[PDB]
Amino acid sequence: VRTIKVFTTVDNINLHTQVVDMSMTYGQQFGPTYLDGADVTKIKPHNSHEGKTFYVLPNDDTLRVEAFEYYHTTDPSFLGRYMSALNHTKKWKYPQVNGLTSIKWADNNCYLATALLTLQQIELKFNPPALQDAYYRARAGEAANFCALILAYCNKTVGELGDVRETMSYLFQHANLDSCKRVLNVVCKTCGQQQTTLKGVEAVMYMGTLSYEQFKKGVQIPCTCGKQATKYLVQQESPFVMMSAPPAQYELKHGTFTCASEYTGNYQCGHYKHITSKETLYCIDGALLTKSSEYKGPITDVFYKENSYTTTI
């Protein structure tokens, strides 16, 4: 019996010393086993593996507690999706573009890059520690684990076409938006005024218009009477708001928003690009960067910084 010493983990923080038999596979000794995302379940240990750290599935109480506190789940389906995704996103390149971490294009990841650039420009705290840790390193330039975790938490695989707003809505449900609140009024001339309150993710996202300013002044929506009603923002308490609308030509002005999602395509497929407002307007497309003092293009999401707003209507 020849052996080597290795470490197993589920969180990459608590390391557990193991002795492994070099005549058996990792699968025979640990169950499913991953080396930096690469599935080594069906391979035998090699001399170079001494002292290396391997991911295993939560198969005992120590590992179950560690995975539960780190990912907020012990389901072996999750860690497998995460490792499968990580085996690809560790080979993506993550260039700094206009001071933000982007992703060089690969595996249809334009939507992922647009969402990653967006997460770096809005105040947000994730509840699962795995998400918050990988978030910090994603800001620092090493976003392989963040992107793999996003794909895993949203039940998305590498290469699949994706939607930025669906992605953001998933990630928001894993963030601490408990304090967020929105109060809206809907006015009809022949029916009266109705107030509704929303909390959490619903207080932070709206579908139907891109302009925060128009949201505050009022938007027309069909009413129950068959006439047309006016809906407007009464009160907002959130670190940011996300206005979305079906892709359409929109004029973005410097200094009036935080960032935005460009979308050229149809309802099945399109190209996602990222507009950000710094000292001027910038468009980021993977590793590509252009600027313009004026912008008129197809926008589908606009992000605004917010703290507390109260109407004067």
Q: Under the rule (CB under 5 A), what is the footprint of Zn ion?
A: 188, 191, 223, 225
DSSP-assigned beta bridge partners for residue 222: 228
Nearest distance in Å: CB 117, ligand A1D7X: 13
Binding partner at 110 among ligand A1D7X, Zn ion, none, C-beta below 5 to 8 Å by kind: ligand A1D7X
Q: Which of 16, 72, 254, 271 is catalytic?
A: 271
Residue 271 lies near ligand A1D7X (rule: CB under 6 A): yes
SS3 content of the chain, % helix, strand, coil (to 5): 25, 35, 35
Find the discontinuities in the chain where C to next N exceeds 2.5 angstroms and give the residue preceding each.
none
Binding partner at 191 among ligand A1D7X, Zn ion, none, C-beta below 5 to 8 Å by kind: Zn ion
Residue 284 lies near ligand A1D7X (rule: CB under 6 A): no
Q: Which of 49, 88, 110, 301 is catalytic?
A: 110
Task: Report the C-alpha dihedral over residues 82, 19, 66, 41, rounded to 10 degrees.
Answer: 20
Annotated catalytic, 49?
no
Stretch of 44-52, 83-91, 182-190, 262-270 contacting ligand A1D7X, by CB under 6 A: 262-270
Sign of CA dihedral 107, 108, 112, 113: positive
Annotated catalytic, 269?
no
Stretch of 17-25, 169-177, 217-225, 266-274 contacting ligand A1D7X, by CB under 6 A: 266-274
Binding-site members are: 188, 191, 223, 225
Which helix (H) or strand (E) element contains residue 270? Answer: strand 270-277
Residue 267 lies near ligand A1D7X (rule: CB under 6 A): no
CA angle 38, 39, 42 (to 5 degrees): 145
- Binding positions for ligand A1D7X, 139-198, rule CB under 6 A: 161
Nearest distance in Å: CB 197, Zn ion: 20
Give dist(CA 164, CA 270) in Å, integer: 11
Backbone angles phi, psi at 114, to 5 degrees: -65, -40
Give dist(CA 309, CA 235) in Å, integer: 5
Point out which residues bind ligand A1D7X (CB under 6 A): 108-110, 161, 266, 268-269, 271-272
Residues catalogued as catalytic: 110, 271, 285
